[PDB]
Design an enzyme around this catalytic site. Structure first.
Site, PDB file in Angstrom:
ATOM      1  N   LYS C  10       0.867  -1.192   0.000  1.00  0.00           N
ATOM      2  CA  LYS C  10       0.000   0.000   0.000  1.00  0.00           C
ATOM      3  C   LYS C  10       0.890   1.223   0.000  1.00  0.00           C
ATOM      4  CE  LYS C  10      -4.555   0.400   0.284  1.00  0.00           C
ATOM      5  NZ  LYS C  10      -5.377  -0.497  -0.611  1.00  0.00           N
ATOM      6  N   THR C  57      -3.771  -5.616   0.537  1.00  0.00           N
ATOM      7  CA  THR C  57      -3.120  -4.316   0.758  1.00  0.00           C
ATOM      8  C   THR C  57      -3.979  -3.482   1.700  1.00  0.00           C
ATOM      9  OG1 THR C  57      -4.149  -3.110  -1.092  1.00  0.00           O
ATOM     10  CG2 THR C  57      -2.108  -4.396  -1.570  1.00  0.00           C
ATOM     11  N   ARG C 176      29.247  33.883  -9.007  1.00  0.00           N
ATOM     12  CA  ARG C 176      27.929  33.511  -9.545  1.00  0.00           C
ATOM     13  C   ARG C 176      26.974  33.207  -8.412  1.00  0.00           C
ATOM     14  NH1 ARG C 176      28.473  27.110 -11.579  1.00  0.00           N
ATOM     15  NH2 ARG C 176      28.950  26.328  -9.450  1.00  0.00           N
ATOM     16  N   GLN C 228      30.372  20.117  -6.884  1.00  0.00           N
ATOM     17  CA  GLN C 228      31.118  18.890  -6.545  1.00  0.00           C
ATOM     18  C   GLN C 228      31.963  19.068  -5.268  1.00  0.00           C
ATOM     19  OE1 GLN C 228      30.553  20.059  -9.603  1.00  0.00           O
ATOM     20  NE2 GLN C 228      30.624  18.447 -11.176  1.00  0.00           N
ATOM     21  N   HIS C 256      19.951  27.227 -12.289  1.00  0.00           N
ATOM     22  CA  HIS C 256      20.702  28.355 -12.851  1.00  0.00           C
ATOM     23  C   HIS C 256      19.959  29.687 -12.796  1.00  0.00           C
ATOM     24  CE1 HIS C 256      23.341  25.238 -14.219  1.00  0.00           C
ATOM     25  NE2 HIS C 256      22.401  24.712 -14.985  1.00  0.00           N
TER      26      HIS C 256
END
Ligand SMILES: O=c1[nH]c(=O)c2nn[nH]c2[nH]1
Ligand SMILES: O=c1[nH]c(=O)c2nn[nH]c2[nH]1
Ligand SMILES: O=c1[nH]c(=O)c2nn[nH]c2[nH]1
Ligand SMILES: O=c1[nH]c(=O)c2nn[nH]c2[nH]1
Ligand SMILES: [Cl-]
Ligand SMILES: [Cl-]
Ligand SMILES: [Cl-]
Ligand SMILES: [Cl-]
Ligand code: NA
Ligand code: NA
Ligand code: NA
Ligand code: NA
Ligand SMILES: [Xe]
Ligand SMILES: [Xe]
Ligand SMILES: [Xe]
Ligand SMILES: [Xe]
Ligand SMILES: [Xe]
Ligand SMILES: [Xe]
Ligand SMILES: [Xe]
Ligand SMILES: [Xe]
Lengths: 295, 295, 295, 295
Positions: C10, C57, C176, C228, C256
């Site tokens: 379920k 279920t 940025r 990263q 972005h």
């Protein structure tokens, strides 16, 4: 302070109904989402905590199921009118009912070229909707609509000759992609009550079908000068084909597909007559509206 | 600490491509959303801030558009294999590419019973997808799928004979509504590289069509003993019809429609054989999965 | 054909629980969405229509409510372990339970600078999740996560020194915007069973809080060389602070924000050091993943 | 046929702006989604394909960015008024501008108990919105709103004494959960033009803050007789605190949490005073609206 306006009710009531033909074995399903909001002499529930005037929203929900059990649910214009009328007739102090219905597509499956008796597919999220306002002593106002009809044409759309000033960077074009999600609404002449709505029952499905057909045909065939010009042509035709419609409203996003200049990469040519690969833009989008009525 | 696994790339890259037949004037459009993630000798970008190993995700985006410009985008199994291979061949230190493609429906419009040369409709949010994993020295693994295919049958579904204990309230039934959103995935035998994928190109569209047809037919015709039993029948047939498939996986929600007892209201009969109006349940839902392979 | 894998259960079971302190009058609410999928000796339900092996279920749904009634629902790691264990102990033929829980925020309201005893606000769609896999004879595997934590920094992010070739158009930058939705998962060492999970109960909330704190602090303070490099720093710290975690996985979109050149309009300066107005991009987005483990 | 109404423009224009204090180093970000629709003497673009009257929607998009570059973007009431006024002053044939702004939350992060100079978190999907209608010769009409404020109280809500008839099954209650998503709108007295809007600038943020505070406090403290009665109390207070507001409108879903009877299982007690575990209902929901104005 004073209550200037008030309405209350139940939203998002999902309803399914099945019709079983005993002779043929054929079953037909209908599925809708319904909202009912009431108005009337209910100010004291807000100002004095007087619940005695409140038809509980849970009761409104029960009423929707009961009404669907005892009446046809199609066309939705009729069902909404029955449902709205019920509230203003049953409750002395309720003077308006506002019923919105969204009809979901369950299209009969073709298996091996024959229509299946009891199996259905959802072909697209396109909806057929109604808004029904039932106002005591003022009759029944019905707006019918289709929405979520998403289309694209890859050529035969232009856009040039627009105003250019110091805010303008857009280049004129004689060949572009045009893609939109169609929302079209037709407003019926006011009906005096349920008897009159019943008398026009065959016109509801026919007008929906006509509105859809005219929309698709005009879109596909118009060498479009702008979204504005093409949408006007659609509305004009619908009005010409059904005299009981007073106005037609379209609301159309212009979903942009941008050329991608690839010439920086090995002189690759992908703009103008050489354009093959485009970048669909999720946002922003143009939004163009118009309401067309009779002279 | 050590990097145990890493992958990076660009997601949600929307791409449209048009093909124009100069002779017939007929145009055909394709629209997809693409994700490409790369793996390889890139740990130092994480651990030492050495960006020299990073192919910028913006460059990956450019590469998708360039590749679409220079190659067919259909069938998506081939396009994904071309795109994935590009990265492992171009960059010495990249050793795997993972390409996911979602294909959006643009179905040619019929106007007055003829196919229109350049106008299209989105008939349903059903998708055709591929996942392509290109691993250097290990070939190309392709999983193809269809998703978002929403169906309902109003009878010829049963569910009885399940385990009953002190946690069970569910009544056995010999007649219920069955509705689901189909997600079906078929996994191809590993291909040695692009030449082998190219050799099997005609099988991709044919197998997609077969998977869809078998799904719809089995759903409509099976007098279903459970979702489990019906889905197994579907998978069995797909495997029988395409020897290059190794496994078929289905994942199916059971979208419940509940009876509504209305007997409290004037003895109204709306349950069992008298059930006409049902309440679709948005949640919870059953979720039933199975992966079927060869003996 | 043969069943290679099967699981069923379920999904989307919404649960709310209230705890009422009789002494203080203070109430605390918990709200979750739960999915339970079972595996075991159930192949015959698929292949032979043998429902006798199916725990319905609907019964699984009942069991979730009953278990929530009789046990604490916090921390979710413990509740999921209790729920999963229940199924493998109760049913001889069920050998694995997979429990996913999404916890929704209900934060106590401060009214006039004091904590309200029974009123709550949803402050953000950030979730705390668990995945608990209970496998008979193999113990309990728990992955804990936070998701939907959306952050932005307006400076102190750079991205330069990446690979440049004929596919590259991206300009190097020393300043940025960086914005992401954080999905972070920490995987616990395998537990032998419920007694062991109970013994570590205080560590669950503390580690969640630490993971959140480290994520936010590192994001705000790192002069980021790339997504990263910053994400690796986060994972490193979490591993250092909780020895019972084996791995930490982050999955981060790079959402972005593009400069807008306005110099075409009256020489307006809006790029580089003059950049004030930016266009957030809905798509495409970078997607950067890493899994960090111990030496 | 005739054009009865027309408006067109650009929707879903995402805008971010940063302000950098050179002295303190502190940066503040603003992010909004903007829609601008224009009206005026533009009928011929629809009826005659005369694009000469069209300010391209792409130009409208450029204008939004330029205006954000040259003006404060806060409070949004002022920015929307500047933007709307621009169009009716610049273009002779444009006579109304309709500007809708949705402001997204970027809340400054606290790291180690101090406000971070340039790092932000999205704490909830609650929005602050404005609708500004600038009509030539009729001034500036501003509706300000907050939306997406989701709250719950676990006790101190009642609902009894409502109308009972043959459609009613709902039991009266003296103790229930109340949860809603608040949408509240306050409509300002008409302003004669931009000079007048500028003169009232400090009132905009203060009134938003007051509306939020009154909403939260009243919700938490009212021993609620109904949604109707509690919402009226909120609106009354807002009107009392800001004389420049003419009306306050609330629109509130009643998001139901249902008791779960577990007595079928070992006589487990989970209803009335024993209720601990509830099932949140996704649909249907009550929907309660009211508009409150001055005597
Ligand atoms: O507060 C409420 N108002 C209502 O109108 C209503 N109807 N059912 N439950 C309700 N609760
Ligand atoms: O932080 C980043 N990492 C990347 O891999 C990348 N690629 N383009 N921009 C980027 N920014
Ligand atoms: O087809 C079904 N399969 C199941 O496992 C199940 N459990 N409840 N209802 C059900 N229906
Ligand atoms: O059809 C269009 N109508 C417009 O108003 C417009 N503005 N930009 N592009 C446009 N295309
Ligand atoms: Cl447009
Ligand atoms: Cl199920
Ligand atoms: Cl990126
Ligand atoms: Cl309600
Ligand atoms: Na009445
Ligand atoms: Na390589
Ligand atoms: Na077991
Ligand atoms: Na003007
Ligand atoms: Xe229905
Ligand atoms: Xe159009
Ligand atoms: Xe494509
Ligand atoms: Xe099925
Ligand atoms: Xe819970
Ligand atoms: Xe990050
Ligand atoms: Xe902004
Ligand atoms: Xe309320």
């Amino acid at each position: 302070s004073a209550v200037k306006a008030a309405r209350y009710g139940k939203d998002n009531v999902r309803v399914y109904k099945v019709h079983k033909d005993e002779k043929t074995g054929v079953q037909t399903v209908y599925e809708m989402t319904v909202c009912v909001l009431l108005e009337g002499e209910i100010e004291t529930s807000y100002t004095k905590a007087d619940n005695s005037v409140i038809v509980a929203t849970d009761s409104i929900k029960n009423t929707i199921y009961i009404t669907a059990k005892q009446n046809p649910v199609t066309p939705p214009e009729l069902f909404g009118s029955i449902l709205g009328t019920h509230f203003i007739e049953k409750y002395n102090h309720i003077h308006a009912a506002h019923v919105n219905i969204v009809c979901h597509r369950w299209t009969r499956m073709d298996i091996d070229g024959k229509p299946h008796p009891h199996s259905f597919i959802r072909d697209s999220e396109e909806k057929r909707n109604v808004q029904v306002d039932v106002v005591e002593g003022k009759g029944i106002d019905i707006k019918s609509s289709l929405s979520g009809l998403t289309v694209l044409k890859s050529t035969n759309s232009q856009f040039w000759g627009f105003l250019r000033d110091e805010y303008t960077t857009l280049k004129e074009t004689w060949d572009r992609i045009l893609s939109t999600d169609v929302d079209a609404t037709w407003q019926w002449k006011n009906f005096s009550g349920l008897q009159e709505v019943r008398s026009h029952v065959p016109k509801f499905d026919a007008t929906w079908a006509t509105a859809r057909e005219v929309t698709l045909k005009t879109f596909a065939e118009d060498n479009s000068a702008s979204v504005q010009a093409t949408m006007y042509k659609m509305a004009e035709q619908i009005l010409a084909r059904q005299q009981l419609i007073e106005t037609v409203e379209y609301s159309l996003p212009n979903k942009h597909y941008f050329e991608i200049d690839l010439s920086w990469h090995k002189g690759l040519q992908n703009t103008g007559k050489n354009a093959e690969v485009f970048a669909p833009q999720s946002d922003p989008n143009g939004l163009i509206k118009c309401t067309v009525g009779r002279s």
